[PDB]
């Protein structure tokens, strides 16, 4: 019986769960911060 590993080297990363969580958190925080800043800049521009 054979065990083919088609994992793409994903096992070699330390704490893959934490790394993946931090990637998602970084992308999410960037998206929300950019969206909020754009909305507030738009509201300030419209008010002015």
């Amino acid at each position: 019986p054979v065990m083919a590993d088609l994992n793409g080297g994903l096992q070699f990363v330390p704490e893959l769960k934490e790394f993946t969580a931090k990637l998602r958190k970084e992308l999410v925080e960037t998206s929300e911060v950019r969206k909020a800043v754009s909305i507030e800049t738009a509201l300030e521009h419209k008010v002015v």
């Binding site: 925080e29 929300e32 911060v33």
Partner: protein
């Protein structure tokens, strides 16, 4: 009267309270030029900010201010 060049208005705005719950709030505040801090590295997270602003507006016409200052 249409002599808006001689009109001005100084108003003590009501005190405003803002609870900084997340880093999104901090980013929004730092995106504002008017929002300035003596200590730029001040940790605003989990902190309540109170704003006591006064607005001085000089009028260009009935609707549009000729100049707006808020300090």
């Amino acid at each position: 009267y249409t002599d808006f060049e001689n009109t001005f208005q100084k108003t003590v705005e009501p005190v405003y309270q803002m609870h900084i719950k997340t880093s999104k709030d901090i980013a929004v505040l730092r995106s504002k030029e008017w929002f300035q801090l003596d200590d730029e590295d001040f940790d605003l997270l989990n902190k309540t900010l109170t704003f006591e602003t006064e607005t001085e507006v000089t009028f260009k016409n009935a609707n549009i201010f000729s100049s707006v200052k808020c300090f």
